[PDB]
Write a protein that binds this ligand. Structure first.
Ligand SMILES: O=P(O)(O)OC[C@H]1O[C@H](O)[C@@H](F)[C@@H]1O
Ligand SMILES: NC(=O)c1cccnc1
Length: 252
C-alpha cells in the first residue's frame, strides 16, 4: 500500500518471537534472572500496547512488565550513553567493568526493536508506528524507553559514567533521553559524581571537548542537583578499547 497511517517504521518483523527468544537467551545466561518466566514477560509486554491507541500509551501500561523485569544492577557500575551506544556496548563486553541499560533484561529485550498496536483491534501494526516528532510522543516505543530509563537512572549510586558523542553538534543534548530523563532522575542522596567521557569522532589531535558549552551546561545542571561533575576526553576510541582489552600491554 502507498500511504501508511503513521510516519515511523512499523513493528519489527516477528516481534513476538524475537522478544520471547531474547528473553530465553537472557535468562539462560544471567543466573539472577534464571527463574523469570518468559511467557509471562511477553504477555506483560503485549499487554502494555496491544488494543491500545499507539498515541495514548502511559508509563502505567508498562508496569506489569516492569515488575516482571525487576532486576538488581550493581549501582556503582552504571554506564549511561547518549547517541553512542556501540562503543558503550563494546566497552562493557570486554570484562563487564560497567553495565548499560541494554545489559539489563528489559533493555536487552527491546534494543533495536520497534512495536505498536491499534486501538480496538488486538493486532500488532507491522506497517507503521507513530513517529515521536511527527505523530506523538506517547507511543509504545518512546514510553517504554522513558519508563525503563528513569528506573535505571534511579538505580545508580556512587560514580555514574556517561559516554557522550563528541562528534555531534550538541555533545550534551538536553532533548536526549540522557539529558531529559536520566540527568534528572539520578538520586543526589546516592550519586556522588557523574563522570562524562566525551568520545572524539575526529582523527587524532583535537580540542578539549570538556570545555564545550554543552558540557558546561551539563556540569551546571548536575552541580545544581548537588552531584559532582567530572569529564574526560577519549581522543581515540580505538586505542581506548585496545587498552581496556590489553591494559599496560601497550602504550596505554
Ligand atoms: O541520550 P539518548 O541516546 O537519547 O538515550 C540513551 C540513554 O538513555 C537511558 C540510558 F540507559 C541510555 O544510555
Ligand atoms: N537502546 C536504546 O535504543 C535506547 C534508546 C533510548 C533510551 N535508552 C535506550
Amino acid at each position: 500500500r502507498w500511504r501508511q497511517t503513521w510516519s515511523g517504521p512499523g513493528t519489527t518483523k516477528r516481534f513476538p518471537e524475537t522478544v520471547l527468544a531474547r528473553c530465553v537467551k537472557y535468562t539462560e545466561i544471567h543466573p539472577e534472572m534464571r527463574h523469570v518466566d518468559c511467557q509471562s514477560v511477553w504477555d506483560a509486554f503485549k499487554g502494555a500496547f496491544i488494543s491500545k491507541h499507539p498515541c495514548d500509551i502511559t508509563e502505567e501500561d508498562y508496569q506489569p512488565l516492569m515488575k516482571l523485569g525487576t532486576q538488581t544492577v550493581p549501582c556503582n557500575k552504571i554506564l549511561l550513553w547518549s547517541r553512542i551506544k556501540d562503543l558503550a556496548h563494546q566497552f562493557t563486553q570486554v570484562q563487564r567493568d560497567m553495565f548499560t541499560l541494554e545489559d539489563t533484561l528489559l533493555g536487552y529485550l527491546a534494543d533495536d526493536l520497534t512495536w505498536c498496536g491499534e486501538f480496538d483491534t488486538s493486532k500488532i501494526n507491522y506497517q507503521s508506528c507513530p513517529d515521536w516528532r511527527k505523530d506523538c510522543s506517547n507511543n509504545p516505543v518512546s514510553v517504554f524507553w522513558k519508563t525503563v530509563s528513569r528506573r535505571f537512572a534511579e538505580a545508580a549510586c556512587d560514580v555514574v559514567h556517561v559516554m557522550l558523542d563528541g562528534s555531534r553538534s550538541k555533545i550534551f543534548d538536553k532533548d536526549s533521553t540522557f539529558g531529559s530523563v536520566e540527568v534528572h532522575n539520578l538520586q543526589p542522596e546516592k550519586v556522588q559524581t557523574l563522570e562524562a567521557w566525551v568520545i572524539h569522532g575526529g582523527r587524532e589531535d583535537s580540542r578539549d571537548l570538556c570545555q564545550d558549552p554543552t558540557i558546561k551546561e551539563l556540569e551546571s545542571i548536575i552541580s545544581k542537583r548537588n552531584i559532582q561533575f567530572s569529564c574526560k576526553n577519549i581522543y581515540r576510541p580505538d586505542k581506548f578499547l585496545q587498552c581496556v582489552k590489553n591494559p599496560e600491554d601497550s602504550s596505554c
